[PDB]
Each structure stands twice: as C-alpha cells, then as structure tokens.
Design a protein around this ligand. Structure first.
Ligand code: QAS
Ligand code: SF4
Ligand code: CL
Length: 301
C-alpha cells in the first residue's frame, strides 16, 4: 500500500492524469484522488480541467457521464465491470413502452441510469435536484426511473404524479430498516439522522434530514450538532469525517456497494501502468445523451 500509493502518485504525475473518485470509493482511493465527490460534481469538475487524461474511480454510468461532458478527454477506469445493478434494470424497451402509454409525461431519468437510457430521456436529474427539476417541468405527470424510492420522494415534495419504472426499481445499498433509526435515537438522543432519498419511506420519514451525499456534506456547515447518523453507503463516513474532524459520523448501518468496492489500490495501479480501460461511447450516444443533461442544466440554470 505504501508501495502502491507512491507508485500511483508517481505514475499520475508522470502521465498527466487527474484522479476523480466517487464518495463511495474505499478510503485509500478517496485519499489518492485529486477530487472526491458525487457523479455530477466530478463531471462538472472534469469540464474545468486543463488536463486531457482522467482516471475515474466509481462505476460505469458515472465514468460515461464524465466522458459525455468531456468527449475529447481520455477517461480510464480500473475495473470495466464496475456498474450499477439498479441502473441496469431499466431498459430502452421499458422506456419506449411507457412513453407509448403516457405520451404526455416527460421521461425524467435519475443520473444513476445507463448511457443508452439517457439517450431516450427528456431530462436527467440527481438526488439533490430531482424535486426542483420535476417542479419546473410543465407537466403535472412524469415518468421517472430507475429508483422507485426517489420517484416517490419527488411525488411527495412536488405533489405531481410520478410513474416509476422499472417495477420495484431500487438501490439495495439504501434499504435500511426504520428500526435502526429507533435504536440510534435511544443510543445518541442528540444525534441528527441524515438519510438518502433512495432510502424507503419509513426511513426517510424518521430522519432529521433527507439528502443526497452532496447535501449531507453541507448539513454540518449549518447544523452545529456533535453527532450525525448517516444513512448512505459507508464511503461517505470517511468523506464526512475528513471534512468535519470536529464531529462524529455514525453509519445508520454498515452498507457496502459491491460494485463501488471493485476498485482497489492494485487495479488502480494497473490502470495507470497500462493506461486502460478507456471509456469509449459512440459519438451518436454522446450527442443524444447530452440533450437531457443540458436540459437539466437549463432547468437548474
Ligand atoms: O450523491 C448521491 O446521493 C449518490 C448516491 C448513490 C450514487 S451511486 N451516486 C450518487 C451521486 O454521485 O449522486
Ligand atoms: S450505491 Fe446503489 S445506486 Fe449507487 S452504484 Fe451502487 S447499487 Fe447503484
Ligand atoms: Cl473535452
């Protein structure tokens, strides 16, 4: 690890790579990254860079997001199989089926979606902006995927009708038990519970705050509470504890995204040695997927 970390830092400098790491990476990889953040934060950061080579540490749809918004940069990932099972359950066939049945409902796709699915979306959204995006659409009905929990949250906050696809679209990592909140309230009476909107409704409704990872790291800037209980993937505990060393961050439960943990010091070192595996999308996919991303930027403009 001493070897691997030094060799990584050496090869990144030597070959002109910037390392971008998602919040759900292992701490060792967060610590060697130039920037750690959420998928949109990392894509927007990449647009600002003078460097034309990126080593991306996350899962495929996010690396592809970076590539869509930075087509002329070389983007490589250490494990080409790192993917989002939830994203992968939504298909072009299901989107087209639902557009045909509800032709007046805009297709709002969570950024946790395949690039192919993005080519068919009317607008992209993040967990932070989903409510605001859906509020600003003309329609009082939207098609939303692939996360049924976030879709239902959006319906609650907007009062709009949200038709969720696919059937039972969810993120296994965020299926905490509401009983975990009951238990931490007893154990740390003054702790603030922050959970993800991908969490099920009973968990959301028992939390002090519901928010994206990006929103979670901003809450201690306005809430002086000593202890925060965190209902997301375990990588966020490391991120939060680094940003706010003066507070305590307690996992609601241990929750690990197996795909996020496919990236390691070893295979990150192999990626810089070989300059593989490059993220390549057909130009047509990039052009089409860009349209609902730009719409998102326009709506949040
Ligand atoms: O930031 C978020 O809340 C979030 C949660 C899960 C996953 S895979 N990604 C993200 C994100 O980068 O937006
Ligand atoms: S944490 Fe959930 S939403 Fe994020 S990549 Fe892993 S399975 Fe997909
Ligand atoms: Cl570019």
């Amino acid at each position: 690890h001493h070897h691997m970390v030094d060799e990584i830092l050496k090869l990144k400098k030597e070959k002109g790579y910037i390392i971008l790491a998602h919040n759900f990476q292992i701490p060792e990889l967060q610590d060697i990254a130039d920037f750690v953040g959420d998928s949109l934060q990392l894509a927007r950061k990449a647009m600002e860079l003078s460097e034309k080579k990126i080593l991306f540490l996350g899962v495929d749809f996010m690396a592809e997001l970076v590539k869509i918004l930075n087509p002329d940069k070389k983007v490589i990932v250490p494990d080409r199989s790192a993917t989002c099972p939830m994203a992968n359950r939504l298909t072009p066939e299901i989107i087209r089926e639902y557009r045909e049945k509800f032709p007046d409902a805009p297709v709002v796709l969570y950024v946790n979606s395949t690039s192919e699915c993005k080519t068919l979306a009317d607008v992209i959204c993040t967990s932070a902006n989903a409510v605001e995006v859906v509020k600003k659409l003309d329609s009082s009905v939207v098609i939303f995927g692939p996360d049924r929990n976030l879709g239902e949250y959006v319906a609650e906050k907007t009062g709009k009708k949200v038709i969720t696809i696919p059937e039972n679209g969810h993120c296994p990592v965020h299926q905490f038990n509401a009983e975990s909140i009951d238990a931490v309230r007893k154990k740390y009476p003054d702790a603030k519970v922050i959970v993800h909107p991908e969490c099920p409704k009973p968990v959301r409704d028992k939390a002090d705050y519901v928010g994206s990872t990006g929103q979670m790291e901003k809450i201690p800037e306005r809430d002086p509470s000593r202890i925060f209980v965190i209902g997301t993937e375990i990588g966020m505990i490391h991120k939060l504890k680094k940003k706010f060393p003066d507070r305590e961050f307690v996992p609601l439960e241990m929750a690990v995204c197996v795909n996020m943990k496919k990236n390691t010091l070893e295979n990150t070192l192999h990626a810089l040695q070989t300059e593989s595996f490059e993220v390549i999308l057909p130009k047509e996919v990039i052009e089409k997927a860009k349209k609902p991303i730009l719409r998102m930027f326009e709506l949040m403009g």
